[PDB]
Design a protein around this ligand. Structure first.
Ligand SMILES: *[C@@H]1O[C@H](CO)[C@@H](O[C@@H]2O[C@H](CO)[C@@H](O)[C@H](O)[C@H]2NC(C)=O)[C@H](O)[C@H]1NC(C)=O
Ligand SMILES: *[C@@H]1O[C@H](CO)[C@@H](O[C@@H]2O[C@H](CO)[C@@H](O)[C@H](O)[C@H]2NC(C)=O)[C@H](O)[C@H]1NC(C)=O
Ligand SMILES: *[C@@H]1O[C@H](CO)[C@@H](O[C@@H]2O[C@H](CO)[C@@H](O)[C@H](O)[C@H]2NC(C)=O)[C@H](O)[C@H]1NC(C)=O
Ligand SMILES: *[C@@H]1O[C@H](CO)[C@@H](O[C@@H]2O[C@H](CO)[C@@H](O)[C@H](O)[C@H]2NC(C)=O)[C@H](O)[C@H]1NC(C)=O
Ligand SMILES: *[C@@H]1O[C@H](CO)[C@@H](O)[C@H](O)[C@H]1NC(C)=O
Ligand SMILES: *[C@@H]1O[C@H](CO)[C@@H](O)[C@H](O)[C@H]1NC(C)=O
Lengths: 119, 440, 121, 438
């Protein structure tokens, strides 16, 4: 359940993480110990927070029509995590912390890997 | 009765870091409740106090007795910095009202209203109702507003002040059915072949349900998926059905069914699985044809062939015939397993009668059909003689066999009986004559 | 002179500016008064400082195989500036304090520096 | 005789924030001069004194007189805070030593050496010579060191310390000629069409030089350029000639030429400009043709046509054909103006002898060649008849003309079992009479 919500534009996250500067900082109210706790415990809060952070990231870029801009990739990821908010709320704060792209997208892919396993 | 509550106001206004102190009395009294946005606190005392109110203490307070009845007072903490409380989540079901949770923390302010970000003016028809206690509400959200950005706006000391920034999310109403299409409407396969068909489903949202089911069989089939969002309100799914080892009774109607909260749409594909290949041949003309010498004729066959026909050849008197024959699939359709082969004999000479054969094969079968071409030819007269018997001889050779007529005053015919005496030899194509003179 | 050395990978700059985050800051030892001054005095220092900044900025990105990537575009721009330095040091042939720029402003400065080489001495 | 300095010592070491005092004893004294990295100072007083040294006061100090005789001191301001002064533009030319500008502020240290970024090792064959006063020098910079990045490393108090990154850029040295190719080996244009050819030059560097020359003319042609960098040591330039409106005298050879410090390549294209289009036609067989009854023949023309021919048709006796003729260019190559036209005639009937014509047109010109085709036939015997006089006559119709013997062109032969037989080179046919007398 909610697995079919997550389209496979997530497979573009690695191309996005390649184009974001190592130095850049992305901001995410991070549910403490989600790296440890079972999926059903954090996942509801995390998917709201990710939807927010990704829309902030979406403000930062602009829409290069030729090729895959970061704007296009992040846009389609916002479409995903918003639909995950929609199903989690239908079917079922922390303190802001600062992540480099590789770290923030680690958390993103872990959250999305929770839905292949959800209740 | 519900509890009475002290102070007896409806609203109650406090400067930040003042004291908030609310005194409740029902003899049945059970508990307070405090609500703002999501946040809630619950207190079992019949008195509620905090010595130094923060802006977040803004909110509604309800005191409830054991008899079930409730009375409420609503509180503001006026604060120059945090004028709005906010929750930045903002989702609307399209065509429903949605709420922008920016409730005020000092109600005595002017023109509580909604504004676009970066200066931009709101969409021409977006209309809203404000409420200091709850927020601002947006009548009849519609798809044009998707990811519209918003600010809540207050005028205080004649100056105009804006909330943290909000992005509206719209969640489609389904107003048209899905759109469904399949990579091939009909399949034909040798047994034990792989079978693979792909269905495309398009809709405004990924919550479109779609399945592959086999008609007159209720159980749903094994499937692998790929989807994409393609920009706002544009989703596409592709669902793929595979049987690794087809078999005859794996034939049937397969259906790709897709529906949504408006209504379904489906598209079927039909599978024929054959136990072994075939060729079937039809001659477009009688297998025996008759041609007057020096005319063209065509020999034409049409045939069904599966798997596709690998070798095609035309042979005459135990020898192949080339550069005068043409072949094409009968129809352009992908379903068409049917094929045409034609051979254009030209200005046929009288010697070229006899059999012409067409040979076609695939892996499974080798198939033949044969044509007999008879070339009519105007008679010719060979000999004119008289026998030892005192009898006259006229001799003519033609296909069809000539016919000989007498007057007095390839196949061969030899024909007999103050005078001039004539024999005439003729068939369906040709007329010819030879003469003898007898003098008495 | 040195108009040949500036290859036309520069048109990619508009895309690079669009893929870099608006609020990302990039650091350049900007020659003060580069705006008002004539080309010849600031251009010599600026191609050096641009080569430095673009090389550091190059380190920050990975290298995708498919498509255009910031690392590809920046690598080609770095090739340009490292040639413009090679010619300026060889035809004129006779630090400022670091300042921080959003990508659009840094690339404004870059595009002005390259527009200096359409009539140099 | 040259200057002399107090302190005498060739090398001096001063603590940070210590005072620096140098005095040069010369009746002819002119200046102190101080150099480190690029930075320079020069001072008029015979004393140089500085109240509190900073690390950047490290360097070399030279005393010089009116003779121009000079004497030098080098000063190390030991500062525990930074061991290196750096000057971080590290360009190097290929095949040449390349200095990494990380002179030391304390000479009293060990193992001063050069080391990679992020704990990556240096390339194995890279070697270097260290020098506290100048930096660390990389010998014989190769292309494999392009964008190699480097730290300068020094062991102090048994503990090893690193400078800010250096990134080694490499200006390639040319070891092969530029590589040159042209979009078309040769051109043909109707006068007033627009010639436009595009060279392509490929080299390791954008300092390859390339030009377009009209052969036997020294003058410069107009041109437009595009070039790209395809990764490291890979540059490509495309240079496009245009003559905006071709005139006849523009016919000639153009050369695209490219040279670098190593050598030269040129590649050439030749332009023909023709004042008006043309067609020329050659029959691959005599225009007069002979065929027997039932025989098979082809008719074949080769023709050179510019512009490319637009209507090709074959007509027999003023009545056009279809489905019996093949049309194809004679060669594949993109410089092709020459074409082949064939018509095939099958088992020709006797009546079909006549004249066959081939008609081809382009915008400029319309041209015809005509073929005369004679179907020979076996003599065929038309009348055998016995006339009132007692004579009997035979008639035969043939091409070539029949000859008649007793035992199209038309022949009749007359006489007072008899047989008539008519022969020409194709065949024989014979007709019969039988006679009895009393
Ligand atoms: C739209 O798609 C599915 C497929 O039928 C429907 O969901 C089923 O609805 C019936 C009746 O409510 C249930 O008995 C099934 O268990 C449901 N199946 C699943 C997988 O959920 C949905 O109702 C469909 N059709 C309509 C008319 O709404
Ligand atoms: C699957 O698709 C067809 C239409 O695409 C469904 O609808 C029927 O189609 C026929 C002919 O177009 C109409 O005359 C009928 O009115 C339709 N049926 C109904 C109840 O209205 C067909 O019913 C679909 N089958 C399933 C299981 O969904
Ligand atoms: C490489 O190409 C250029 C063009 O010919 C040469 O430069 C010219 O060299 C001649 C003779 O030395 C001079 O008189 C010209 O003034 C130069 N012209 C220009 C535009 O520079 C260069 O010498 C060439 N030769 C080789 C061997 O590479
Ligand atoms: C242009 O290119 C041709 C070769 O592609 C050069 O021709 C050669 O020139 C050398 C002497 O310079 C001769 O020894 C060779 O025999 C020539 N080879 C051929 C095929 O002709 C030509 O010299 C070049 N001209 C210029 C100006 O570069
Ligand atoms: C007939 O069909 C069923 C279901 O498709 C399948 O289980 C069965 O194996 C088929 N029969 C044979 C002999 O394979
Ligand atoms: C070609 O023709 C024009 C006009 O006649 C003439 O001016 C020009 O000099 C000619 N150019 C050459 C190279 O002959």
């Amino acid at each position: 359940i909610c697995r079919n919500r997550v389209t496979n534009n997530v497979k573009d996250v690695t191309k996005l993480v390649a184009n974001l500067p190592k130095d850049y900082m992305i901001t995410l109210k991070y549910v403490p110990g989600m790296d440890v706790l079972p999926s059903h415990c954090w996942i509801s809060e995390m998917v709201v927070q990710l939807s927010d952070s990704l829309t902030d990231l979406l403000d930062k870029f602009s829409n290069i029509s030729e090729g895959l801009s970061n704007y296009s990739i992040i846009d389609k990821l916002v479409n995903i995590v918003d639909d995950l908010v929609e199903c989690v709320k239908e079917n079922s704060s922390p303190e802001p912390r600062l992540f480099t792209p590789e770290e923030f997208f680690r958390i993103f892919n872990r959250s999305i890997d929770a839905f292949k396993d959800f209740v | 009765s519900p509890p009475s509550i002290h102070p007896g106001k409806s609203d109650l206004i406090v400067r930040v870091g003042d004291e908030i102190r609310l005194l409740c009395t029902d003899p049945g009294f059970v508990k307070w409740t405090f609500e703002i946005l999501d946040e809630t606190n619950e207190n079992k005392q019949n008195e509620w106090i905090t010595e130094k109110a923060e802006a977040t203490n803004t909110g509604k307070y309800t005191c409830t007795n054991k008899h079930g009845l409730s009375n409420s007072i609503y509180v503001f903490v006026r604060d120059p910095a945090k004028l709005f409380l906010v929750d930045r989540s903002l989702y609307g079901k399209e065509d429903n009202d949605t709420l922008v949770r920016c409730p005020l923390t000092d109600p005595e302010v002017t023109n509580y209203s909604l504004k676009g970000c970066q200066g931009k003016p709101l969409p021409k028809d977006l209309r809203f109702i404000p409420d200091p206690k709850a927020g601002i509400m947006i009548k009849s959200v519609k798809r044009a507003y998707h990811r519209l950005c918003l600010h809540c706006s207050v005028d205080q000391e004649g100056k105009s002040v804006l909330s943290e920034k909000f992005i509206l999310k719209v969640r489609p109403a389904f107003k048209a059915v899905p759109v469904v299409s399949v990579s091939k409407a009909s399949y034909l396969l040798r047994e034990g072949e792989e079978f693979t068909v792909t269905c495309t489903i398009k809709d405004v949202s990924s919550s479109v349900y779609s399945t592959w089911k086999r008609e007159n069989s209720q159980t749903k089939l094994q499937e692998k998926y790929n989807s994409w969002h393609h920009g706002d309100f544009n989703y596409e799914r592709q669902a793929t059905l595979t049987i690794s080892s087809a078999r005859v009774n794996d034939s049937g109607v397969f259906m790709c069914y897709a529906n949504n909260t408006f209504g379904s749409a489906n598209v079927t594909t039909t599978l024929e699985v054959v136990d072994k290949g075939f060729i079937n041949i039809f001659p477009m003309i009688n297998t025996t044809v008759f041609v007057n010498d020096g005319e063209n004729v065509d020999l034409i066959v049409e045939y069904e062939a599966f798997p596709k026909p690998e070798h095609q050849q035309w042979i005459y008197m135990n020898r192949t015939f080339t550069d005068k024959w043409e072949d094409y699939p009968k129809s352009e359709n992908e379903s068409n397993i049917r094929y045409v082969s034609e051979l254009h004999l030209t200005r046929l000479k009288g010697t070229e009668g006899g059999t012409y054969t067409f040979l076609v094969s695939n892996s499974d079968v080798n198939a033949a059909i044969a044509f007999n071409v008879y070339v009519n030819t105007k008679p010719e007269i060979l000999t004119y003689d008289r026998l030892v018997n005192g009898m006259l001889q006229c001799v003519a050779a033609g296909f069809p066999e000539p016919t000989i007529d007498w007057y007095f005053c390839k196949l061969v015919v030899q024909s007999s009986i103050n005078g001039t005496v004539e024999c005439k030899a003729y068939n369906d194509v040709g007329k010819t004559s030879a003469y003898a003179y007898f003098n008495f």
